[PDB]
Symmetry: C4
Subunit: 390 residues, 4 copies
């Protein structure tokens, strides 16, 4: 009988290793007989019994005749879809949850909560689904472009916390947090501090008390806005990550942003969503981060880690841990998630490896997974193995 | 060990929103690898654990070579099929329930009842299936064309109520209601009042005591016949909806029908099945309706609502809630259904969007879904995104 | 904690009606994207929860490159497959049970028993499978061609009864009966009486005391051999069906066999497996049968019935019930089976509808189902809808 | 509550028979509509409820455009996949467990354990997954090529025993055995005795206290290294099996290795994974093995058996029990596994039948299965039925 889930101590390990590649378009060739879905913004969320691989589809397949428009972000056909992790997301394997061009999902211990935003840009609408039922909505508040995480929300004892943001992509987007219980929004949380631009937060539990998020600023800085949300008081605060190892793309050179922690620096315009995930141990906390190998291009994906300290106040360079995607291969969005073992949580990072060939052809993605696994060093990189010409 | 289901209070909300689109022919192009089934008359029915998406297939897929005859209404190949709502209705995903060119289905809390009418026009036959087992039949009583709802029947305390009808499409069709329990017919019900012509009723619970249906008159009027069925006494009465906002297609201008409520008016010839769903509150009853945007063509679909009053007596215009499907897009049959949240019911309306290219090509449909969901105004419309040329 | 099944009283009804068509080759065209399996000798068996549609595949699909051989009876590639009844039996939907060119299956209330015969003609081997495990075997005793029912075996209190036979197609073929429990052969039953040729028995439960079988004589008579098997004392007895309505194909004109009951007669060479099922009542026993509409060809299928009496002694013509398949459509093997309702058993007859374009193209079959359904008369026939040039 | 599994006494039987063929490429022709996965190194492992069919895929299908490399051993794309035994392993039916170019799997009665080694040749990494969660890793020790069984590991009382090996392919490869419990390596076992080269062990339980393995020597001999592992003491000893029937391929003539039991002999270069499975009886143990028909080539597959005695000491030829695959057909890797019947275990051997047509086209395999079944002699051989040109 189902009880509410809580974050547990992470399971023992000291390094990440290549775990699993989901590359649907390995079967999408004209010579083939398969129907992989055209997608982007994939993420993974796990419940006590099952892991689900989510994505936003353009409601089209490779091969097919609806490639035109699959390079855009929003339209009336896009849908949040999923399969069990390990299954290839095809037309028939997938299930279509709801229309959305921005999404999230999380399992609270008893049931799946699905999140989907669609509607017109100036008045977008977030929709909440608990299992099969549509249960709530939330309205755009800045009337620019209401949007959400493109990664998993976080549930503790029945309460599910979700980042949403609204505002200009090149101007101001003040983010908020929805608290959602059994499909219904029961509280809005307004963060304090450096709030001028926060989008596409990647969140997780530092403990039973605190959720932390590494987010994206699309205008002002190449440093990641770092949220600290206390779930006991339902309050949040945002300051920029102090580490010399700037995680955004585009970014400047490491350390080159001189001055105090809060200094915005150069190359702030533009952005990318970043992997972030906690390794909780008895007396220390590990924070793992991913960023592209290239400073200005969505190419490659490397892994970093730092134990304890305060991300807001520490200049310290993050320890480079290894290359997950070499700079020759595409490396786009990345997200954190946790797999539930018998008595312990297993932190992972998934990486969106987009197949980009311009607007003249199809535009989709593969997903690579790296998980905390044993000891030593990260050993192997990941390729998609897709020839976009076929 | 499940209990019989009963209609519950509706979930909180005050507006409908775009929820989900099932457009299987987005994957029916020649350079694709999918086999979506060719169907029409789709509808949805929900049990306590699952929503099923039903339709009548022509036992043929796109791409395929059996297009010829997919624009006819009846033949020896048509079958009632279903998939789990959210899955694409393909050859492999679908399950074939029974031979039928007219159908319904509903869950009683324990098991599925599947209804499927087939046979020669002059002597058609209704078939009842309970789970896997064929359990009963009902013979033609007017010998013109026995037929049924093309949407979900309704169960309360293990008793399922089903509308059937038989008669000319341009003359008298005096409908009846069957009371079906565990797959077997236990009582016929003969409605009184205005029984000239009643077909393809879209029914639902107004309360524990009353079932209401918004039906179709294909011969005499563009006002929808309105059934009130007392499930405590198993009697039914029918009168025409009095509202100025005529729901049928074709129809004259709104309010144009001079004279009192019972006035049949002009443009009675023809018709279309219309969406109808209840929003049950503690102290009021909300009635949600859909109708085409075009006055004469099966094009577009708009949403409407009025709270309480007597549908038989009120000439009051229905409130316009929004455009679910614009007039640029096809809008055919519509239906009501209810999704089961943990403690309350969620009213929804489905829209059949037919792909009509004429007799020389394939003839099928997509399904769009809107549901009561939060507050405010209906925000976005639905397109199928299908080019029939591919 | 589950329990053995026993035959129950058949459930109310007085006529059969068209239920379900499984016609996978409707989707097997060259311009399609489906993969129906190529099969023959299909049958259906039902346990307490689901029905399974079994067949013998040639391990090849349509469209495909392996049409050569699909009109042959035995080879090293043939397997017994199934799907849940309602599903299209394709490459991906089907499950492969074991190598076999002759088969049977039945559920005892706890688990499925799968029967499969393969091997060389003069030393064939019957193989039994219980759940996932291979459990027993039986050897050729005549060294001509060991073979079995090609339809459901019959289980009572955990004991399952299966007909096998060994011998020449144009000579002696003395069948035996295996009593099987939980995958293992516990007893052999040697039938007394008219035993010179008995094959492809279609069997059902007349009572808790008696199994009856309508079988096929391929060399001596156009009357069908009829088995009476006493499951209480494990003894079997065979005599020819005395009825003027000769059920084999080919056959002489009805009644035209001159002599007493045991009289063999003319046109005894050739034969076909025939449908036969019991309608059990407290009052009386109904016996439904099926035979081709043509006397000399596998064309059409007619439904017949006599209530009570002794088919060993009664020469009276069986009552014609209706045409399940017209003489314009193919009509091959037919089989009996019973779907389990909550309280009652529903008798059905399935009809293999073979697509026969000769040995230069593919060779497979559709399945049509008719079940006892309500009262009145049988109303509609079944067509496959398949054009073999597509 | 689910308890730990232990080996049980074997099911009654005297001989193996052809059970099942899995040949996915029968449906891989260019004029078809299916997508069989391209694989090699298949094996099978069963738990209390289900058997799974594993393999190592090249992440490509037939037909498709990624054949280049499919004859390769290791790359960054290979993955451990599985379907339920009985299902065709296609793109859609299969589940992707983890990246791997060497694998293993087993069920301990509660949960599955999946083994997958990947990484650089020189610093390879073994990965352990328990259900959904990656739980442990193990590093290369000889830094030459860490690798594992490519067949089922073995679980008793929740303790899973698995063979790993590292070192030269033409020199020393000293193996180790891991004790894995609920996904974690709790003990390593260092074997004594003859240990210069042992790889690709096929292991099974000989009792509740002894596991035996028939392994491969790719460098020094054509006799198979034979591991004995005491699971009570957690110690293992390895000596070459002495029988004159050399099970390796390539091999010299039977008996031609002159000398005492421990002598190496000629033609010890090269190797093949070989079949081995126990038949456990009351006061007797059976030992079934398989080896190729050709002495030099990977063609054909014969079955051999011997009861009791010591494989370390006994020189006598194994009793030839029949041809499973004729020398005209491909016979590559073979492996042992056991199916769990209700009260006993059924021994089987699986055979990899590689479709080899060189480096310029696809490279994959079918899986053939023979199991202990009844009495007498092994009756029929297995062909794939695949024409590589189609
Ligand atoms: C966050 O809070 C949750 C809930 O308080 C913590 O999990 C709880 O504490 C321990 C986790 O190790 C569990 O104790 C165990 O009890 C079971 C019997 O239920 C027993 O088998 C074990 O030997 C152990 O004593 C406790 O049950 C568990 N409670 C729930 C409701 O899950 C969690 O550890 C906290 N996370 C932190 C501190 O990072
Ligand atoms: C229509 O009639 C049915 C039949 O009585 C009504 O269903 C009943 O609804 C009540 C509350 O509305 C349920 O009571 C609740 O039971 C749960 C435990 O099951 C308990 O935790 C709650 O505190 C509450 O007492 C009752 O169980 C339920 N019975 C059945 C058989 O469903 C239904 O409410 C009526 N719908 C209307 C009036 O709109
Ligand atoms: C063949 O013999 C078996 C004996 O096992 C008969 O099965 C039995 O059928 C009777 C029919 O009335 C069942 O009685 C019922 O029991 C249920 C218990 O839930 C009760 O609610 C009903 O009111 C009724 O009394 C009986 O349970 C059943 N036995 C078993 C073990 O299931 C079967 O009917 C015989 N076949 C014939 C007569 O054709
Ligand atoms: C090996 O050990 C297992 C575990 O004790 C034995 O399995 C038992 O078998 C008996 C029947 O002989 C059952 O009544 C017990 O319930 C079984 N125990 C468990 C835990 O399943 C097995 O018989 C032993 N002997 C062998 C394999 O020869
Ligand atoms: C709602 C929305 O359109 N989000 C965009 C997002 C956005 O353009 C920027 O972050 C700026 O606000 O970035 C792009 C992107 O890949 O950079 C993906 C997202 N596309 C989708 N989620 N569909
Ligand atoms: C049984 C039957 O053929 N019902 C018809 C329906 C019917 O003609 C009208 O209700 C008037 O009598 O028209 C509609 C329609 O599209 O208008 C299609 C239906 N097609 C199917 N349900 N198959
Ligand atoms: C085991 C076997 O080969 N059975 C044959 C069967 C047989 O040839 C005759 O009955 C004569 O004994 O008839 C033919 C047939 O359709 O007439 C189909 C069967 N084909 C298969 N079951 N494979
Ligand atoms: C890990 C690994 O690559 N194992 C090899 C194996 C190996 O080369 C020899 O056993 C010598 O060490 O050869 C066999 C083989 O087919 O001979 C295939 C294996 N391929 C894979 N398992 N991928
Ligand atoms: C379609 O079927 C009808 C009726 O069977 C037939 O008259 C017509 O010629 C067919 N059309 C084509 C294009 O074959
Ligand atoms: C057809 O099948 C027979 C059966 O063995 C075989 O001899 C023949 O060569 C086959 N022909 C082709 C073209 O495959
Ligand atoms: C296969 O790939 C290799 C590189 O890995 C390349 O050199 C070779 O030409 C390729 N083969 C073909 C036929 O393209
Ligand atoms: Ca930035
Ligand atoms: Ca009208
Ligand atoms: Ca005959
Ligand atoms: Ca060797």
């Amino acid at each position: 009988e189902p009880e509410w889930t809580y974050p547990r101590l992470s399971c023992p390990g000291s390094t990440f290793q290549k775990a699993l590649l989901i590359s649907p378009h390995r079967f999408g060739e004209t010579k083939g007989n398969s129907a992989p879905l055209i997608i982007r913004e994939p993420f993974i969320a796990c419940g006590p019994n099952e892991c689900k691989h989510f994505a936003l589809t353009h409601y089209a397949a490779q091969p097919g005749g609806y490639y035109n428009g699959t390079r855009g972000d929003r339209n009336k056909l896009r849908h949040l879809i999923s399969v069990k992790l390990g299954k290839i997301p095809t037309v028939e394997n997938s299930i279509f949850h709801m229309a959305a061009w921005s999404g999230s999902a999380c399992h609270d211990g008893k049931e799946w909560t699905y999140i989907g935003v669609d509607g017109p840009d100036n008045d977008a609408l977030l929709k909440v689904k608990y299992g099969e039922a549509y249960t709530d909505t939330y309205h755009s508040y800045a009337n620019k472009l209401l949007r959400t995480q493109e990664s998993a929300c976080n549930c503790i004892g029945g309460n599910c916390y979700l980042m949403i943001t609204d505002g200009s992509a090149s101007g101001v987007s003040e983010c908020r947090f929805l608290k959602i219980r059994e499909g219904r929004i029961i509280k809005e949380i307004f963060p304090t501090g450096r709030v001028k631009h926060t989008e596409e937060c990647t969140c997780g539990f530092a403990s039973n008390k605190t959720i932390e998020c590494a987010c994206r600023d699309n205008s002002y800085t190449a440093k990641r806005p770092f949220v600290k949300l206390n779930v006991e008081t339902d309050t949040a605060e945002i300051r920029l990550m102090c580490t010399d190892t700037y995680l955004d793309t585009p970014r400047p050179d490491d350390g080159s942003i001189t001055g105090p922690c809060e200094s915005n620096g150069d190359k702030g315009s533009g952005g990318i969503k970043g992997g972030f995930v906690h390794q909780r141990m008895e007396s220390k906390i590990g924070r793992w981060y991913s960023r592209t190998m290239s400073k200005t291009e969505r190419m490659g994906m490397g892994l970093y880690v730092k134990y304890d300290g305060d991300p807001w106040a520490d200049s310290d360079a993050l320890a480079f841990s290894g290359v997950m995607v070499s700079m020759k291969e595409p490396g786009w969005y990345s997200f954190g998630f946790e797999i539930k073992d018998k008595e312990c949580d297993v932190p992972c990072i998934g990486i969106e490896m987009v197949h980009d060939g311009g607007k003249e052809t199809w535009h989709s993605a593969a997903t690579a997974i790296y998980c905390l696994m044993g000891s030593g060093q990260l050993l192997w990189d990941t390729v998609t193995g897709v020839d976009m010409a076929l």
